[PDB]
Design a protein around this ligand. Sequence first.
Ligand SMILES: C[As](C)(=O)[O-]
Ligand SMILES: C[As](C)(=O)[O-]
Ligand SMILES: [Zn+2]
Ligand SMILES: [Zn+2]
Lengths: 157, 158
Amino acid sequence: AISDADLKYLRRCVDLAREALDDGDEPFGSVLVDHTGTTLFEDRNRVKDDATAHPEFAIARWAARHLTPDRRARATVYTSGEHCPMCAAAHAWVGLGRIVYATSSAQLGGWLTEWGAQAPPVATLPINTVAPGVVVDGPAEELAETMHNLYRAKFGR
Amino acid sequence: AISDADLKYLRRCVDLAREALDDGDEPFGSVLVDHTGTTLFEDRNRVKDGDATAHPEFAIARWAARHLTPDRRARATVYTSGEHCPMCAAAHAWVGLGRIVYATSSAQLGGWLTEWGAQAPPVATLPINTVAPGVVVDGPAEELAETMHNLYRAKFGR
Ligand SMILES: C[As](C)(=O)[O-]
Ligand SMILES: C[As](C)(=O)[O-]
Ligand SMILES: [Zn+2]
Ligand SMILES: [Zn+2]
């Protein structure tokens, strides 16, 4: 279930991923939203300015520092790309709520393989393999081509 | 695959885990050792201030990314009292660290929790190589099973 409201936030994730691309980083963007609708924190990949500089992970730590457990449980995380296992686990450790993603890690994995990219050193596990209790929605068919194009800009060869 | 020298570092990890439990934190301890046998960085769990991501293996991955070249990372070993959760195993692999040696597996931990009637963590106890297929992993250490059973029971089995 991805509503029109969820798509709007996913579009903002895509914009953040493009901000990252244009700054020399990798095209991953994410947004943290309170149950009450309000955007709490937005981020993107900052690999240039540690390979662990993932925005979803920054979200998890920001949430643990700024929000009570009750507010974390009720918050939603939107993301352009489905969390890697590092980030899915961090999300569950700090007790955040629903995740909605635009493109799956399986999708990205298949595209990387087409570009002849040597396999990343972390497996593309579905969020629920890592974090079984998290409610996960995605991918968003409307945004597949756009994300393919952003990924091609960074990782195509 | 567990040498005398490896076991000595695992005993240091256990001591770090005990330090953590005595300070109010969870009993997890880890040490980063370079290819010359020199300890570079030691750490322990620090979750009690409210950040459940304050794991020592993740601190080591970030420390290593800041302080070590890619070549030095690849040749360093991470010793740990408990096998890396998926968060920490992924971070380890993303930063390009080398071998991991652990005293107790995640299979041991998960089996003990269910023995004790304790709630499972919200992160699945995936073995390191499910998350990070290329990392060389050694453990667990039979010599340390009873100690770590006792230590995890103290924190998680009440
Ligand atoms: C979707 As990611 C590589 O920022 O965990
Ligand atoms: C063995 As652990 C919970 O510090 O990743
Ligand atoms: Zn990630
Ligand atoms: Zn961990």
